[PDB]
Sequence to fold (1175 residues):
Amino acid sequence: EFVRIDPFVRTFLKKKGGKYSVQFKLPDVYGVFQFKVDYNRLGYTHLYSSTQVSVRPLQHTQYERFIPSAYPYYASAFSMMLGLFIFSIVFLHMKEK
Amino acid sequence: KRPPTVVSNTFTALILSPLLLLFALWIRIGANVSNFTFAPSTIIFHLGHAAMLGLMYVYWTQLNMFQTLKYLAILGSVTFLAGNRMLAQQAVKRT
Amino acid sequence: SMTRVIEVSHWGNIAVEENVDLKHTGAVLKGPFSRYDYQRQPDSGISSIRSFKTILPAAAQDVYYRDEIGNVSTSH
Amino acid sequence: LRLSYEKQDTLLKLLILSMAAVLSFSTRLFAVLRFESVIHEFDPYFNYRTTRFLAEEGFYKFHNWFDDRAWYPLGRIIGGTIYPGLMITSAAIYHVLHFFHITIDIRNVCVFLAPLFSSFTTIVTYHLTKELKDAGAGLLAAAMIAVVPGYISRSVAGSYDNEGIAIFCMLLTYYMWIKAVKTGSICWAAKCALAYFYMVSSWGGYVFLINLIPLHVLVLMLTGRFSHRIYVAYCTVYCLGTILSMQISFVGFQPVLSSEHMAAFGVFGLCQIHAFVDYLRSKLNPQQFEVLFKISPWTGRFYSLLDPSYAKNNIPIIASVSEHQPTTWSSYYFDLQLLVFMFPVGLYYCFSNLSDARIFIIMYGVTSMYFSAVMVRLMLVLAPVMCILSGIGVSQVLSTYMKNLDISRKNEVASGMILVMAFFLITYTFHSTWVTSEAYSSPSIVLSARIIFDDFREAYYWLRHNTPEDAKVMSWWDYGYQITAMANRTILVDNNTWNNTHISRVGQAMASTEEKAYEIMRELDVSYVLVIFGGLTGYSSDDINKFLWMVRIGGSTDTGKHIKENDYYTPTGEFRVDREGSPVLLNCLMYKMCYYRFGQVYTEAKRPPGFDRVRNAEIGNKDFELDVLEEAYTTEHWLVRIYKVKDLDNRGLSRT
Amino acid sequence: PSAMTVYALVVVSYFLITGGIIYDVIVEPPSVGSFLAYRVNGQYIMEGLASSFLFTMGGLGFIILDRSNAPNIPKLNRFLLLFIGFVCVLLSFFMARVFMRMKLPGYL
Amino acid sequence: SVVSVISRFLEEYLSSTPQRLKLLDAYLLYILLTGALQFGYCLLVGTFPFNSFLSGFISCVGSFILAVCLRIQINPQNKADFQGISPERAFADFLFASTILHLVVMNFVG
Amino acid sequence: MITDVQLAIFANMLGVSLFLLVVLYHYVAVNNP
Ligand SMILES: *[C@@H]1O[C@H](CO)[C@@H](O[C@@H]2O[C@H](CO)[C@@H](O[C@@H]3O[C@H](CO[C@H]4O[C@H](CO[C@H]5O[C@H](CO)[C@@H](O)[C@H](O)[C@@H]5O)[C@@H](O)[C@H](O[C@H]5O[C@H](CO)[C@@H](O)[C@H](O)[C@@H]5O)[C@@H]4O)[C@@H](O)[C@H](O[C@H]4O[C@H](CO)[C@@H](O)[C@H](O)[C@@H]4O[C@H]4O[C@H](CO)[C@@H](O)[C@H](O)[C@@H]4O)[C@@H]3O)[C@H](O)[C@H]2NC(C)=O)[C@H](O)[C@H]1NC(C)=O
Ligand SMILES: CCCCCCCCCCCCCC(=O)O[C@H](COC(=O)CCCCCCCCCC)COP(=O)(O)OCC[N+](C)(C)C
Ligand SMILES: CCCCCCCCCCCCCC(=O)O[C@H](COC(=O)CCCCCCCCCC)COP(=O)(O)OCC[N+](C)(C)C
Ligand SMILES: CCCCCCCCCCCCCC(=O)O[C@H](COC(=O)CCCCCCCCCC)COP(=O)(O)OCC[N+](C)(C)C
Ligand SMILES: C[C@H]1CC[C@]2(OC1)O[C@H]1[C@H](O)[C@@H]3[C@H]4CC[C@@H]5C[C@H](O[C@H]6O[C@@H](CO)[C@H](O)[C@@H](O)[C@@H]6O)[C@@H](O)C[C@@]5(C)[C@@H]4CC[C@@]3(C)[C@@H]1[C@H]2C
Ligand SMILES: C[C@H]1CC[C@]2(OC1)O[C@H]1[C@H](O)[C@@H]3[C@H]4CC[C@@H]5C[C@H](O[C@H]6O[C@@H](CO)[C@H](O)[C@@H](O)[C@@H]6O)[C@@H](O)C[C@@]5(C)[C@@H]4CC[C@@]3(C)[C@@H]1[C@H]2C
Ligand SMILES: [Mg+2]
Fold:
């Protein structure tokens, strides 16, 4: 169980090589979380294990960049800059008629 | 949801078009660059200004903000010196 | 772990400061602790400690006895 | 020897400004001189911890920082939830002081940052007032803002809050805007834009500032004094300020989407329309011209300032704070002694010689005065305007009466007036000194009684050294930053109050019986509980006088339908802790807490044993047992009590 | 309004505002008690009206005197004007100081 | 019905305007047209990258405003409203504000 | 360190001197050449 206050994820542990290992993706919600194993079986020793894991949301160096859907905007600003430069070459050095 | 790439490319070409329109209008007026005379201060100013804008572009892809701000500090100081000299010369010639 | 730092200065004097981590080892405490019983019954609390005295080299001038969070106003 | 007029004038200005800055810095540090230098009032401990992080981890790790030690069930992102200006200023000063080896700890820089910025404020005020009129008024305004008690109250040595630097930022922005209106230049407008960006990052009052520039421009329009200079200045400030304000992370898209930044957009559109119409009215003849002739609402902490009834009547967490009530005339006089008697004279001088920058200072004065009348906490932004105007007022009188004198190049009335004015000024100085000394400098971590008992610090230190590294303690939102800064343990609620459901959950846990509250605590995975009692020490602000606010906040959100705040009073409507108390108050978890073994401790001379100093009563339940809690610790004067939440019953018993 | 009517409105507003009107509205006080003995931030309606009157009258005395300085004025009337101004200002100041002392004991 | 006045005004504008001011007005029309096409595209497809739309758009608006302010300061009919802002100083301020604006726009776009 | 009764006296003297000096400056400014 991958739990914050109530279980976000709950999966089975596939027996593989003497270890119970599961590979899964963390959910979208961030915060601190708890891996939890509970084995309550009739006539078996009740075992409980919880490990605490904090989940950082994102970093400003890891957002998606160079979106194709924003090729217009990415273009526009640059054109502006280019425009300015041409102006700064014609507005200064122009001979009146 | 995101639009298809064909539409974005069409709009990018359309955004390039106004620059061409501006150039056509400027050559209709008859604007010339005849007053430029290859004086060292003016050339240094234009070179520094172009380098500053190219640096502004480069910052967007690789450099972070501290490094870019440092580079801008240097290039802007140089462009400021060259521009002060050139603008003094221009004010003298104008009067 | 006690760390003793001795800074020498040829201008005036030399200043020594020591950080002291200290722990009460034997007979760990089980159950609840109650300030009430601790105060109104001098018997209870035998194995605990309340104070200890340091001896300084008779030329000490600026003693301060600071903690990691601020001054401590309990000393004599 | 003889000196020129210019030399003596410059020497006088320099000497006066130096003395004023030294006095401003000197007057701020009274608390540091008394009690040992420590950050106080437990609001700035958060800022202090944040500053330390920025000083030992870097900026890129600080910009995207996730804190897992606060609001444990949820997640708190400190990198984008607060305006970062104060921390950046402190870290920059620290790194500069460390480059040249002047090595000073972060705590000393944080403690003495506010006096330094208060010293800078004097010079900024002098230049601002010099723009208005003759320098003499500038010197007077600087000297008066040096010693004003409100500004010295909200910024004392040892108080590391953002308002201190904020005021200096606001005055710098106002100076840049006045210089842009007078000069009418793009360069000054860009300087104003950068200053406004700094102001946006430093304080939450930037909204305020961006609703005084447009209003002034609109006021100028109505008068008919609009020119090209105002157009250039305001438009240049608007674009750059909007953008620069965007990239502050916490703000986001607030300026273009929210409703607090719509006055600026409206005035910008009106300015464009007006300029174009004026330009079109010149190129065409009069006959031809006459022929031609999803968005967010108010957030709420700003709305309650416009309508001073909403927050007190509806939201039980904003009005819960102490300094949110309207101000009385006695408080007005206490803060400013002679400044009040000079506001009308300054307003009269401004209204007598109307200029392009006077209108702005008048508008600032009026609106700020209203806001000070609608809240105590906003008295701060009133002190800076007053001084300026008061300065002007006083200065004018002097300049009016020091010319009638015969020695200057009936007449004695002017000499009498000069003497009178000097008496007023010196008595204002004495008043300011007394108010600073005896009222405003005080610690909130230590209870001054001369004997001091620092039970708070002792409890936090125990909690720091004698709990497991992952122990979670839950308290009230007031003692949120203080625990993390000193006790250094994972906390549940905090003094941010950005999720009212969580605080309501904690209030329900503190206001219900032991069974339901034990269920809540088990659900939230809490280990230790820290409750301030203050019954022996006589502390008025204990964790029992806030119990009513706990009930009100807890019984509001969709699960405290069984709290019913009207169930903790007596039949006639009283709130007594004695036998006549409500049978649900005397069995509350909060009452079982902070009264354990308190039934048999004498606390007075001619008074029965189970006596409570703060409530002057007699405990209703003298003896009771805690089924679900062990007493982990209790300070020397029973001021802070820490209880360890128990486990489930081993043999699986009930343990109600 | 010609920049004089607006000033009159501002003066009236200032007096009323410094009377703690918002306080009265938000927290209803009884007219006259029984000056709060120990509560700095405490406003009865009558005491506040009186005090704000003192503040406004002091400002009026300053402007009334400041104006007196104007030239080409008859002396018999100007002496009386000067008297009124001095009286108003000194009374306002000394009164307000005394009131604050009486309300908040231990002052200075 | 309102075309004769437009013809007259358009004719007049040309005579009372120098070469530099006409050139500047052409540049200003280019800025306005690029901004209009960008805003129209935004109204057509929507705003998933809202910050990029804001960056690219306010770049246009800011360049437009700086062009208008430069035009106002240069025009000698207003030589009496500035008194010290020479044309060269005006161009200098234009360059400074433009550099700041372009830097912030780059720091805001994706 | 420094007792309060010293800091208060210093602040009072400094402020009074400051205001008196400012009043003097006004005299000097009125009488210009
Ligand atoms: C920041 O942190 C620092 C460090 O923590 C803080 O500094 C500390 O501040 C305290 C103030 O509370 C200082 O305390 C002082 O300690 C001295 C020394 O006392 C010890 O020696 C005494 C000697 O007794 C002799 O005589 C007896 C017989 O009479 C013999 O039996 C003895 O053997 C000796 O020969 C001894 O009597 C003292 O006993 C005390 O302690 C024991 C516990 O061990 C108790 O059981 C006792 O009952 C008793 O309480 C002790 O062993 C004291 O002399 C100081 O007392 C002065 O002040 C008292 C009030 O605070 C007053 O009652 C005393 O009479 C005495 O008064 C003196 O000064 C007055 C003016 O101030 C005069 O009016 C008066 O006449 C007299 O002259 C005091 O208790 C710490 O030393 C100090 N620590 C350091 C390192 O400097 C600092 O405050 C913090 N900053 C803050 C909070 O802002
Ligand atoms: C002496 C005290 C002065 C106080 C000034 C107050 C400044 C407030 C700072 C607010 C912080 C906002 C966060 C921010 O600006 O974003 C940071 C950029 O990180 C930075 O560069 C922070 C440097 C800020 C300095 C900018 C000038 C401030 C001048 C104000 C007077 C992003 O850095 P990067 O990771 O480099 O992002 C660039 C990546 N691209 C690919 C997109 C190019
Ligand atoms: C602009 C770029 C440069 C920026 C410069 C920033 C200037 C910062 C000014 C603050 C200076 C800090 C001085 C200071 O820390 O003093 C305090 C408390 O001790 C005192 O009594 C000091 C109170 C008054 C001293 C004020 C002097 C500051 C002068 C600065 C111009 C000491 O606190 P403690 O932590 O108690 O130090 C004692 C520790 N010992 C072991 C040494 C005993
Ligand atoms: C909740 C808080 C609300 C805050 C409200 C802010 C109140 C602002 C205080 C008033 C500002 C005074 C401005 C001012 O001085 O304008 C005056 C007098 O002329 C006028 O101003 C008349 C116009 C009235 C508009 C006043 C501001 C209204 C703005 C609302 C958007 C100018 O007089 P004029 O006669 O217009 O111009 C001078 C010509 N003379 C020949 C007379 C010299
Ligand atoms: C970290 C510290 C840094 C220092 C400071 O605190 C925080 O932050 C400073 C600000 O930057 C302030 C300055 C702004 C610019 C302003 C320009 C004027 O220059 C005029 O000079 C005339 C003769 O040529 C021309 O004719 C006029 O046009 C031209 O305006 C000058 O008088 C005052 C000045 C310098 C301000 C003084 C106060 C300063 C230094 C503030 C300090 C308190
Ligand atoms: C200094 C500058 C700062 C910026 C600015 O001026 C002053 O002030 C901004 C405003 O905030 C404007 C926005 C408001 C919200 C509005 C929502 C629309 O949502 C559409 O979404 C489509 C998807 O399909 C639907 O089809 C449509 O029906 C639906 O209206 C969106 O398109 C336009 C948008 C974002 C406005 C654009 C112009 C803005 C940014 C203005 C600028 C000019
Ligand atoms: Mg605050």
